[PDB]
Design a protein around this ligand. Structure first.
Ligand SMILES: *[C@@H]1O[C@H](CO)[C@@H](O[C@@H]2O[C@H](CO)[C@@H](O[C@H]3O[C@H](CO)[C@@H](O)[C@H](O)[C@@H]3O)[C@H](O)[C@H]2NC(C)=O)[C@H](O)[C@H]1NC(C)=O
Ligand SMILES: *[C@@H]1O[C@H](CO)[C@@H](O[C@@H]2O[C@H](CO)[C@@H](O[C@H]3O[C@H](CO)[C@@H](O)[C@H](O)[C@@H]3O)[C@H](O)[C@H]2NC(C)=O)[C@H](O)[C@H]1NC(C)=O
Ligand SMILES: *[C@@H]1O[C@H](CO)[C@@H](O[C@@H]2O[C@H](CO)[C@@H](O[C@H]3O[C@H](CO)[C@@H](O)[C@H](O)[C@@H]3O)[C@H](O)[C@H]2NC(C)=O)[C@H](O)[C@H]1NC(C)=O
Ligand SMILES: *[C@@H]1O[C@H](CO[C@@H]2O[C@@H](C)[C@@H](O)[C@@H](O)[C@@H]2O)[C@@H](O[C@@H]2O[C@H](CO)[C@@H](O)[C@H](O)[C@H]2NC(C)=O)[C@H](O)[C@H]1NC(C)=O
Ligand SMILES: *[C@@H]1O[C@H](CO)[C@@H](O[C@@H]2O[C@H](CO)[C@@H](O)[C@H](O)[C@H]2NC(C)=O)[C@H](O)[C@H]1NC(C)=O
Ligand SMILES: *[C@@H]1O[C@H](CO)[C@@H](O[C@@H]2O[C@H](CO)[C@@H](O)[C@H](O)[C@H]2NC(C)=O)[C@H](O)[C@H]1NC(C)=O
Ligand SMILES: *[C@@H]1O[C@H](CO)[C@@H](O[C@@H]2O[C@H](CO)[C@@H](O)[C@H](O)[C@H]2NC(C)=O)[C@H](O)[C@H]1NC(C)=O
Ligand SMILES: *[C@@H]1O[C@H](CO)[C@@H](O)[C@H](O)[C@H]1NC(C)=O
Ligand SMILES: *[C@@H]1O[C@H](CO)[C@@H](O)[C@H](O)[C@H]1NC(C)=O
Ligand SMILES: *[C@@H]1O[C@H](CO)[C@@H](O)[C@H](O)[C@H]1NC(C)=O
Ligand SMILES: *[C@@H]1O[C@H](CO)[C@@H](O)[C@H](O)[C@H]1NC(C)=O
Lengths: 316, 40, 240, 46
């Protein structure tokens, strides 16, 4: 859905604590601002992507204190009040399964929505679903009993509503067993959250790559700025330092090109995640294989670091 | 007396839903809403 | 419905007339085009370490070879200023291409048709949409039916009338607290539970939370009134 | 007849088959013929 916001002092990266390197950097003019406008443009968008995915409802719906969801047991995906952050049981698996520079001017800005606010929007969508069906999308939330919601669902896949009620015990026991298999699976597989981890790994690899470029000589006598300045005059220093300014600016223009290109991949995924939020969670899709394989009955969203997980429920 | 206030943002109104195993809300009436959407 | 539509298009007129907010999504594209060219013009004023930004003030001061050592710097920095602009413009062209491909899809599905996709053609249930042109963009006026004044009712999944469980063909069952009716899911309009409005499967033992009511049969009183017609034919024939 | 709908004669539909179709109006009228038949029988008696 998003990636780490990153912002850089182009001056501190190229020229940290040197007025000389600053005066030589002025010879290139606006390029440091052009880079900072681009990284700001990325960074601002990361909030927008998260806002389009999670902030689809403008009322924070809350589940009733009593649970009579027809024998379906959402205790595994609803909030757990016993916890220091009010996230669900399956969300605490997700927040563990993803495992996640200062002095070089590189800075990681915070997201606008905290992981608590994302737990709130997630809970509001899920509480909206299990109490109010499609209606909490299309207007104000209207309550409906969950076994009745599941009847209207079965009619959405072209199955007759008695095929639910004549089997409701089995349908719930299969649902309850399936959600257990989600927990068991997510403990077991390391590749499960692989998309999210690969996004973290790429943004991290690019910052460590950008830092390690500070060690490169670029054909200068040293990478260390004061090794050049301490032994040379204004002329021979300008020759030498102007290679380091060239090389380091080329390193930022590389990082920012990668991060812009990588931001478009995250954008394309975030819009897909916003569409699946609207069409799999706030509704029931007729699209074949769009909301997971089978015929779609409903979906439950769960939050993850920089991402979203959908639990899609299907009649097979 | 004007100032720049700073605050934790409200995500929406808090709104518990009147769900019971035999209760349903159905609209007696509707509104027709025209909305604008803008694309580059 | 016509008055609420005419009212709503009036609110679109008044909204867009009153305050300059909504079209920021087009303005931010026009602005990044202007800002990127404006930046690209400003880069010409940089030295790239040469004795000047002004090419003729290099050429009209130096010879053919003391100048090269300067001019090659300007060619280098300037060319990198173009490569940066053209990269940003290509990356930007993807953002607009994506947006355009969505605008073509929203035209296809919300204008040339009707969409059953939730929120895709604006919040609500989609009726229809009207396209409007805008500078470098498209505006869609999506028209939507929005449920407004709900009442709470009691409900049950099925009725049992004659040892058999009955279900709606369309709609849901509801009670005003004293009687039972069937009604369409998205607009309260109650009907007496008939053998036409409902269909049957199985017996009463299985469905959790089923309830008891009469089911009407519209064939019955038509035959009963044929029995009372018949009774007055038999009675009169006893008379002569 | 409550599950089905009816169109044309049987020449056109490639792969059509023959079977009975129940009209649930029929025994609801046939019971109403036997009742009527009972009326006449008892009316022969006085
Ligand atoms: C639940 O809905 C019921 C159907 O609308 C409603 O019952 C109906 O009530 C009206 C009176 O308010 C009756 O109207 C008739 O009353 C007498 C009958 O002799 C006539 O003199 C009148 O002219 C008029 O025709 C309906 O007959 C009656 N329907 C039935 C099937 O009983 C209930 O009152 C509603 N309950 C609540 C709590 O609101
Ligand atoms: C819905 O309507 C049903 C049909 O009238 C009704 O079922 C009937 O319930 C009564 C009370 O439990 C039973 O009464 C008899 O129960 C046993 C024998 O079954 C005897 O020991 C008792 O003395 C008494 O005679 C009926 O037998 C039973 N009828 C059937 C066909 O099962 C439901 O109770 C009604 N439910 C609601 C919630 O309205
Ligand atoms: C399904 O039911 C159809 C109606 O009974 C039946 O059609 C009938 O088929 C027979 C034999 O093919 C025909 O018999 C007559 O054939 C010619 C006249 O066409 C005469 O020379 C014969 O002496 C004989 O009387 C019926 O005329 C024909 N009737 C109709 C309306 O089609 C189908 O054959 C049955 N099919 C199956 C698979 O059972
Ligand atoms: C629809 O009903 C809910 C609650 O169910 C009702 O509770 C009784 C008061 C009575 O009306 C019963 O017939 C129903 O079963 C209403 O929720 C209440 O809302 C008020 C605020 O308006 C709140 O103070 C109460 O604590 C709520 N109580 C419960 C149990 O929900 C709801 O307001 C009704 N909605 C509409 C629009 O009619
Ligand atoms: C819903 O399923 C959960 C398990 O996911 C049930 O909670 C367990 O209840 C047993 C018996 O009280 C305890 O031993 C476990 O420690 C509970 N587990 C957790 C994670 O809380 C819950 O009882 C089920 N709900 C219903 C209505 O059956
Ligand atoms: C439909 O399939 C389910 C299993 O997917 C069947 O349910 C099982 O039935 C056996 C007995 O036949 C029991 O031992 C299992 O405990 C049941 N499992 C569950 C989850 O309830 C079901 O019987 C099948 N129904 C039909 C009519 O074939
Ligand atoms: C449905 O809601 C509309 C308003 O959105 C109601 O129409 C108004 O009705 C009142 C009188 O009850 C009039 O004063 C207004 O002028 C009407 N407005 C319009 C736009 O015509 C309508 O009556 C409601 N219908 C029901 C059955 O509740
Ligand atoms: C509904 O819940 C009540 C408890 O409030 C319970 O007594 C009743 O049996 C339940 N009915 C169904 C259909 O679940
Ligand atoms: C019975 O019907 C006949 C016509 O079929 C009529 O002449 C006669 O008046 C009727 N008798 C009574 C008692 O209505
Ligand atoms: C179906 O296939 C068989 C051969 O397996 C053929 O004899 C028969 O005529 C076919 N029937 C139809 C209705 O096509
Ligand atoms: C026969 O008809 C008479 C009235 O003419 C009625 O009293 C009696 O119950 C009937 N008997 C039967 C067997 O229906």
């Amino acid at each position: 859905v998003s990636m780490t916001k990153t912002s850089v002092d182009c001056t501190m990266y190229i020229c940290g604590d040197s007025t000389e390197c600053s005066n030589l950097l002025l010879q290139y003019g606006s390029f440091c601002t052009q880079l900072n406008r681009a990284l700001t443009g990325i960074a601002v968008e990361q909030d927008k992507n998260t806002q389009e995915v999670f902030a689809q409802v403008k009322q924070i719906y809350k589940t009733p204190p009593i649970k009579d969801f027809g024998g379906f047991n959402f205790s595994q995906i609803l909030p757990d009040p016993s916890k220091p952050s009010k996230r669900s049981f399956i969300e605490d698996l997700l927040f563990n399964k993803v495992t996640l520079q200062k002095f070089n001017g590189l800075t990681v800005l915070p997201p606008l929505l905290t992981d608590e606010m994302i737990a709130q929007y997630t809970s509001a969508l899920l509480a909206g679903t299990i109490t109010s069906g499609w209606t909490f999308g299309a207007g104000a939330a209207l309550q409906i009993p969950f076994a009745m919601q599941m009847a209207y669902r079965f009619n959405g896949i072209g199955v007759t509503q008695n095929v639910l009620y004549e089997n409701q015990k089995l349908i719930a026991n299969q649902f309850n067993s399936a959600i257990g298999k989600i927990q068991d699976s997510l403990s077991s597989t390391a590749s499960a959250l692989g998309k999210l981890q690969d996004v973290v790994n790429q943004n991290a690899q690019a910052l460590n790559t950008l830092v390690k470029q500070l060690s490169s000589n670029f054909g200068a006598i040293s990478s260390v700025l004061n090794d050049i300045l301490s032994r040379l005059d204004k002329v021979e220093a300008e020759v030498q330092i102007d290679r380091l300014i060239t090389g380091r600016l080329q390193s930022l223009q590389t990082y920012v090109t990668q991060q812009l290109i990588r931001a478009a991949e995250i954008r394309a995924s975030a819009n897909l995640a916003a569409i699946k939020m609207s069409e799999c969670v706030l509704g029931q899709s007729k699209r074949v294989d769009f909301c997971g394989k089978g015929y779609h009955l409903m979906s439950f969203p769960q939050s993850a670091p920089h991402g979203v997980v959908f639990l899609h429920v299907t009649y097979v | 007396s004007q100032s720049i206030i700073a605050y934790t943002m409200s995500l929406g109104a808090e709104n518990s839903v009147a769900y019971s195993n035999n209760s349903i809300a159905i609209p007696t009436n509707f509104t027709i809403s025209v909305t604008t959407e803008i694309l580059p | 419905i016509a008055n609420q539509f005419n009212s709503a298009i009036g609110k679109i007129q008044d909204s867009l007339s009153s305050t300059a907010s909504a079209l920021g999504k087009l303005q931010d594209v026009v602005n990044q085009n202007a800002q990127a060219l404006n930046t690209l013009v400003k880069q010409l004023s940089s030295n790239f370490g040469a004795i000047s930004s002004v090419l003729n003030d290099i050429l009209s001061r130096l010879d053919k070879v003391e100048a090269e050592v300067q001019i090659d710097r300007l060619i280098t920095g300037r060319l990198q200023s173009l490569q940066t602009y053209v990269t940003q413009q290509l990356i930007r062209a993807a953002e607009i291409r994506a947006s355009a491909n969505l605008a073509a899809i929203k035209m296809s599905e919300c204008v040339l048709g009707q969409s059953k996709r939730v929120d895709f053609c604006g919040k609500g249930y989609h009726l229809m949409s009207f396209p409007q042109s805008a500078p470098h963009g498209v505006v869609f006026l999506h028209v939507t039916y929005v449920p407004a004044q709900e009442k709470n009712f009691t409900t049950a999944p099925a009725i049992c009338h004659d040892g058999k469980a009955h279900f709606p063909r369309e709609g849901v069952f509801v009670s005003n607290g004293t009687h039972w009716f069937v009604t369409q899911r998205n607009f309260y309009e109650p009907q007496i539970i008939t053998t036409d409005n409902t269909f049957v499967s199985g017996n009463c033992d299985v469905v959790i939370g089923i309830v008891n009511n009469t089911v009407y049969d519209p064939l019955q009183p038509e035959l009963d009134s044929f029995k009372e017609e018949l009774d007055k034919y038999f009675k009169n024939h006893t008379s002569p």
